Structure formats: C-alpha cells, structure tokens
Design a protein around this ligand. Structure first.
Ligand SMILES: O=C([N][C]C1=[C]N2[C]=C([C][N][C][C]3[C][C][C][C][C]3)[C]=[C]C2=N1)C1=[C]C(=O)N2=[C][C]=[C][C]=C2[N]1
Lengths: 238, 200
C-alpha cells in the first residue's frame, strides 16, 4: 500500500487511514486537584509591558495568530521581539505553535533567543475524511502544523484530528493534555489564548478575551509555601 | 528510465564533480547523535564541509533528520545554500495501521526539503507532506519517498548520499561505503570517472 500514491488518485491524505486515534485516570484527577482556578487577562500583548506578569512561569504555551492561519496578525518579526526569557522561570518549558512555513525555522530561532533548547517536535496531523481533495514557495500540499517544545534549565509526539473548517483558527486541546501529563509546574501561561481556550490550572492572556479576572497578588497567593514547588500531578498538602 | 547506478566510497574523499548535476539530491546521513552508535558516523564539521553545492545548479534537497540533527541539518542546509521550503514527516504504522514507539515516544521521522536557485518543470503540490507507512526495515526510509520525488521531478537525474544497497533505484546514482563495489552506465560519467580515477 502506497497512501501517497493513493492521495494523488483520490485526495484521501495518508493520515486519513490511521486506524486507532491500565488507565492514566489518577494523573488526570491529581492534575485536577492541583489545578488553580482558571485566570485570564484581556491584554494587547504588543502594547503591554510583559514583566507585569508574575511569578515567573513553569510552562508557557505560545499560540500567536500567524498571517498564514488565514487563507491584528503577528509576523515572526513581531513574535521574535517578545521578551519571553524575562517571564520564564530558571527551569521553564515552552510550547510554541509554528504553523508549517517559515515558523518551523524562525520559531527555533525564537527558542534559542529566549534561552530554550528544543527537545520535542509535536505534529498536528489533519485529516480530510469529510473533504477528500498552497503558498508559492511550497513543493507539497501542507497537511500538518508543528508545536515545538523547549526546555530552560537542566503520550506520543503526534495529534490526529480532521482539518478544521477553513478560517477556524483553534488548535487541538490534546495539546493541554500533553503539557499537563508532563507535570512541569502549576504556574501555566497561555499567550494569545481566547475566551474559548480558558482552562483550569492556566492563566490565559490575549487581546480577544472579553473579560479579565487576573490579579498578580491573588495569582501569586496560589503558589505560596507550601504549594510553590508542586508538580501539578502531586496532591495538595492540608 | 535508467537502471540503478552506485559507487561504494567515502563520501568525504570522492570528487563528486565528475558526476555533474541532479534535479534532486537526497541524503540519509549517519549524523553524530552522540549515543556511541552501532555504525560509523560523521562529525558536524565533516557534514558542514560535505561538497553538496557542486551537485545542483537548480533543484531540491531531501535531508533526513533526527534529534539534534533537526537543528544541524537546517545549518547544513543553509550553509550548502538552500532555503527549506517543506518538512516531510514519516508516520510509522504496524501491519495493522496502528502507530509505533526526548520526553515523548517518537511516532514520526522528519525529512527537511531544501530548494536552491530557480527550479522549473517540477509538479509542485502533487503529493502531501505526510507519509504513512510500515517500519518494514531497521534504520531506513520508506519506498514512498522515491515515489513522491519521481512524481515531483519525473525522468530527471537524481543522486543519493549515504544510501545503502537497497536504496538503489532507477535514475538514482547511490553513493555510500556499504554498496557492493561500483556499477556505472551513463558513459559521460564512465568517461569522467576513468580519467579522474585512472585505476579507480
Ligand atoms: O554509506 C555510508 N553510510 C550509510 C549509512 C546511512 N545511515 C543512516 C542512518 C540513519 N537512518 C535514519 C532513519 C531515521 C530517519 C528516517 C530514515 C531512517 C544510520 C546509519 C547509516 N549508515 C557512509 C559513508 C561514508 O563515507 N562514511 C564515512 C565516514 C563514516 C561513516 C560513513 N558512512
């Protein structure tokens, strides 16, 4: 079976044909027990002293709205100017959504800049089952997006879903599952998050949020000894 | 179509110029992923200094990567004077089309796609950038990529670096130190070889 040779015949992407897309139930419930209240702050990130967020963050999910996502936007020019290094913790992770164009390169440049080294490349692989069937530079129809994982200081790498209805910009939630299952820290920040992505255990910050509950002193209060260090997968301590 | 040709050799010492120009270069190089690996590697410098730029005036590079070789291949690929325009992922399925097994299990392999100059004739956009295929072999790519590439540049001259014996395909000269001797047929290369290597 050649599923590339097939796609060419029909328009059923090879990924269309991947069959199956001791339970980890405690880990989920321990995430849930540890999770902060959801928080969120409507903020024009460009126009926004970034240092006005604290404490530093154990994990960061960067989902900036790419020019390409559409067939205010951020260019890699704009994204690369962010001072992420300044709100990451000494031991910190980052998950940067990169698209499928220049971002696969410029995002690595971003990671190095903010002092990360990429240890994982996670692929969102989109199916066109409901729709059997490109920028000029490209050679092949592009049928996936990349999330790059970066570490600072000392579940598989795939996500299979249907291609979203074109112009719908959302990323598979599975991403949160993968982050949360790593047990990295309870200080979690989603940049360029939306009302739709707001989630317990996360501080969502972005321009399109319609309401704000954020308060630094209050947020900080959630990680005061003896809670500061916790994994997110641990119990709390009475 | 042209029967498989190949040349067992150290791809560090060979005069690749004799071979001329190809629309497509592919390499599955043995990167120095410092695992103390079970086969011979090249250092970074060895790879950087590889004499790629001579092989193409215009056309495409297919470079397989892994671990840190995702950063170095990009380096190599820029140093060689390519821009990366595509990144093909291979998804490894069992005989039952289920996925197979660095903080995560790797279910996929990456092949960066570089362009050099202004290439024309190419059926760009024919395949898509995902390959779904069984892990039939040990440390090898799938036959599907020779399919995708011929559809891309049908009937053109193509060369492969660090290709092992089963990678040998029509239209493809394969270079590598694990090939059974030399097998050459394009007289214009025979000519150029004999005189450059008067006794091999
Ligand atoms: O011919 C040579 N190397 C043959 C070859 C190619 N490779 C590739 C891999 C990596 N597989 C990548 C997998 C994962 C990604 C998808 C595809 C499969 C592993 C092993 C391997 N041996 C060779 C020629 C030479 O001059 N030379 C000189 C000095 C030292 C070595 C050396 N070696």
């Amino acid at each position: 079976n050649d599923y590339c040779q097939h796609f060419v015949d029909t328009g059923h992407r090879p990924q269309n044909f991947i069959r199956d897309v001791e339970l980890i139930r405690l880990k989920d419930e321990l995430i849930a027990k540890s999770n902060t209240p959801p928080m969120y702050l409507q903020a024009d990130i460009e126009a926004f002293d970034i240092r006005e967020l604290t404490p530093k963050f154990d994990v960061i999910l960067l989902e900036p709205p790419l020019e390409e996502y559409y067939r205010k936007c951020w260019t890699w020019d704009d994204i690369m100017k962010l001072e992420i290094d300044e709100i990451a913790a000494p031991r910190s992770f980052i998950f940067l959504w990169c698209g499928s164009g220049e971002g696969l390169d410029l995002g690595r440049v971003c990671l190095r800049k903010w002092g990360y080294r990429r240890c994982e490349d996670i692929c969102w692989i989109k199916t066109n089952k409901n729709n059997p069937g490109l920028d000029p530079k490209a050679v092949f129809q592009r049928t996936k997006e990349h999330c790059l994982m970066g570490i600072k200081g000392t579940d598989i790498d795939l996500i299979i879903t249907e291609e979203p209805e074109i112009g719908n910009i959302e990323k598979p939630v599975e991403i949160f599952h993968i982050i949360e299952h790593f047990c990295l820290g309870r200080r979690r920040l989603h940049l360029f998050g939306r009302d739709s992505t707001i989630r317990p255990g996360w501080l969502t910050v972005g321009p399109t949020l319609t309401n704000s509950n954020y308060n630094a002193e209050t947020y900080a209060s959630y990680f005061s000894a003896p809670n500061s260090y916790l994994t997110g997968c641990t119990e709390e301590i009475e | 179509l042209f029967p498989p040709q190949w040349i067992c050799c150290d791809i560090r010492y060979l005069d690749v110029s004799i071979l001329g120009k190809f629309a497509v270069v592919m390499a599955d190089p043995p990167w120095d992923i410092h695992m103390e690996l079970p086969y011979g590697t090249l250092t970074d410098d060895e790879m950087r200094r590889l004499n790629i730029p001579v092989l193409q005036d215009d056309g495409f590079l297919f470079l397989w990567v892994t671990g840190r070789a995702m950063e170095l291949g990009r380096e190599c690929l820029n140093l060689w004077g390519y821009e990366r325009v595509d990144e093909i992922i291979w998804v490894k399925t069992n005989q039952l089309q289920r996925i197979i097994r660095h903080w995560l299990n790797h279910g996929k392999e990456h092949c960066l796609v570089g362009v050099k100059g202004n290439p024309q004739g190419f059926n760009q956009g024919l395949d898509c950038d995902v390959i779904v295929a069984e892990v039939r072999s040990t440390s090898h790519k799938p036959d599907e990529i020779y399919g995708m590439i011929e559809r891309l540049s049908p009937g053109t001259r193509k060369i492969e670096l660090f290709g092992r014996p089963h990678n040998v395909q029509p239209n493809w000269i394969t270079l590598g130190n694990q090939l059974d001797g030399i097998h050459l047929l394009d007289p214009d290369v025979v000519a150029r070889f004999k005189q450059r290597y008067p006794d091999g």
